[PDB]
């Protein structure tokens, strides 16, 4: 056990076994200021959980999806990503490709929603 953000400097493979530690800490003059800090924490948490549900990843911490990895985003191989890079370094590399990936996941699930809707119709 490392603690909150303990694996920030750890490799992506090693830091992915402690996702629960960071996940559980995202939810919980000194009056309204302290009260609006709690409402901001809930709204920030709820819009992240909404994104997971839209991508079909609701209730999951590691969600393998159907969107293929465009090599333009990152040409590195798996060995030097999950064993040589940390999540802070990785976020810097793909910070500009984040929004195009988010749209790809959003539409891919929307296609899967109608694909399973038609399969159940038979």
């Amino acid at each position: 056990f490392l603690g909150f953000l303990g694996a920030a400097g750890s490799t992506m493979g090693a830091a992915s076994m402690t996702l629960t530690v960071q996940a559980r800490n995202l939810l919980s003059v000194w009056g309204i200021k302290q009260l609006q800090a709690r409402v901001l924490a809930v709204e920030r948490y709820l819009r992240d959980q909404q994104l997971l549900g839209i991508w079909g990843c609701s209730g999951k911490l590691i969600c393998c999806t159907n969107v293929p990895w465009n090599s333009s985003w990152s040409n590195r191989n798996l060995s030097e990503i999950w064993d040589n890079m940390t999540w802070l370094q990785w976020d810097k590399e793909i910070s500009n490709y984040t929004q195009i990936i988010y749209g790809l996941l959003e539409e891919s699930q929307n296609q899967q929603e109608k694909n399973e809707q038609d399969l159940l119709a038979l």
């Binding site: 490392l2 603690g3 909150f4 953000l5 303990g6 694996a7 920030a8 400097g9 750890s10 830091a15 992915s16 402690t18 996702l19 629960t20 530690v21 960071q22 800490n25 995202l26 939810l27 919980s28 003059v29 000194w30 009056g31 200021k33 302290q34 609006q36 800090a37 709690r38 901001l40 924490a41 920030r44 948490y45 992240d48 994104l51 991508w55 990843c57 999951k60 911490l61 590691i62 969600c63 393998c64 999806t65 159907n66 969107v67 293929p68 990895w69 985003w73 990152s74 798996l78 990503i81 999950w82 940390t86 999540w87 802070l88 990785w90 976020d91 990936i101 790809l104 996941l105 899967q112």
Partner: protein
């Protein structure tokens, strides 16, 4: 390779948020509203870019300290009936030569508990509080700018340590590097629940009761080559300073209205002596030697380091303005900064007491500090300096101040607020079935 979504990844970015107070007789910086405290996780392999001069915790603390100040001066007496003609004579009853024509024995007509009746009362006012109008007729120094709120007698000005704690989804990164100069990558970073006890000690030209450096004297400036930027010195060992107000002031309560009392200096029981501060001459000269050593690393080994006294301006910025015991001293540090450095005894700083206090540099807001009964003694720690350099092989450094954010920049230099971005996407051989 397919996109895989990870939630809860240890990723953050710089952000500004409203950190909330926490703290471990009422106080000005109310700890009753602050939540009780409880914590630190070391972050190996993490290098973080800090900047104490663009830190928003300092800007937020300045707003919070001011807001906690004037919200504690709302419920208590507003001294608008004290803007009257005072018929003041000099105290010459047992005065030393130094404190000659510094207390004035002012008599005036005050309102009584009964509206129609009048009250002839007298009080002792410092010369810094009254201005003559043309026994002579004086009036309080701030009666043409605003009316002054009496400092409430049960609230305490003593700094209580406060902990600024980040809300959920944010983290406070603490730079554990012992030679950090306030800016640049800090190779030893840890995550804390929230900051250590940061005492809101209001001071000038000297950082009192602060935190000491770990290894050596730390010199921190936004741009060391820019003279217009203040230089924050931090001592590795403290230089204790012994404050005192030798006068045995007597507090007298004047009933100036229904439910309102005005606390006036009755009479000093004994001889009139000047307030002063003592700094050890050997310790101060030793500390300045250490300061100069690390002050030569930015100006050269052959540079002549000269310490002069404050250039000029307000009394709050030309003097070591501080407060302890409830009385506000304005000490003259021209004896601490008088030396030139080339490649049992004590220093006494004559201080002056003032009662109408405007400290956040806001014209229009007073605070009448009531007299403190008895004799005041006070022992602090000089744990830093706020120096300013003059515009040759000789550099002249003069004490600075006024801007209160430099007092708290010396406590929040190692802290940083980041926002956790836990939604990360990375390639993997997964494929959703």
């Amino acid at each position: 390779l397919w996109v895989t979504v990870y939630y809860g990844v240890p990723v953050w970015k710089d952000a500004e948020t409203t950190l909330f107070c926490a703290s471990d007789k009422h106080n000005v910086w109310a700890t009753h509203a602050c939540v009780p405290t409880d914590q630190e996780i070391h972050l190996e392999n993490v290098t973080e870019e800090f900047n104490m001069w663009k830190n928003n915790m300092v800007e937020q603390m300045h707003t919070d300290i001011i807001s906690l100040w004037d919200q504690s001066l709302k419920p208590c007496v507003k001294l608008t009936p004290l803007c009257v003609t005072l018929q003041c004579t000099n105290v010459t009853n047992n005065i030393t030569d130094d404190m000659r024509g510094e207390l004035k024995n002012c008599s005036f007509n005050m309102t009584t508990e009964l509206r129609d009746k009048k009250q002839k009362v007298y009080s002792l006012f410092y010369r810094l509080d009254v201005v003559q109008i043309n026994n002579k007729e004086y009036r309080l120094i701030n009666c043409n700018t605003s009316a002054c709120t009496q400092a409430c007698p049960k609230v305490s000005f003593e700094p209580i340590p406060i902990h600024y704690c980040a809300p959920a989804g944010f983290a406070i990164l603490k730079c554990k590097d012992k030679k950090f100069n306030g800016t640049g990558p800090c190779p030893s970073v840890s995550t804390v629940q929230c900051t250590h006890g940061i005492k809101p000690v209001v001071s000038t030209q000297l950082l009192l009761n602060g935190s000491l450096a770990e290894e050596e004297v730390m010199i921190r400036s936004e741009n060391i080559t820019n003279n217009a930027k203040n230089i924050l010195v931090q001592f590795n060992t403290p230089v204790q300073i012994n404050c005192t107000r030798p006068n045995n002031n007597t507090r007298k309560s004047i009933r100036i209205g229904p439910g309102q009392a005005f606390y006036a200096t009755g009479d000093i029981i004994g001889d009139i002596r000047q307030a002063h501060c003592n700094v050890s001459k050997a310790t101060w000269n030793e500390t300045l030697g250490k300061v100069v050593k690390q002050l030569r690393k930015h100006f050269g080994n052959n540079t002549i380091i000269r310490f002069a006294n404050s250039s000029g301006g307000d009394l709050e910025v030309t003097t070591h303005s501080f407060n302890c015991g409830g009385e506000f001293f304005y000490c003259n540090t021209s004896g601490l900064f008088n030396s030139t450095w080339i490649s049992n005894d004590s220093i006494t700083l004559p201080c002056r007491i003032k009662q109408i206090i405007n400290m956040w540099q806001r014209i229009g807001q007073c605070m009448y500090a009531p007299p403190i009964q008895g004799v005041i003694r006070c022992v602090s720690n000089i744990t830093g300096l706020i120096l300013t350099r003059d515009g040759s092989t000789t550099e002249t450094f003069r004490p600075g101040g006024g801007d209160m954010r430099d007092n708290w920049r010396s406590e929040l230099y190692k802290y940083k607020v980041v926002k956790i971005e836990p939604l990360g996407v990375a390639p993997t051989r997964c494929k959703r079935r």
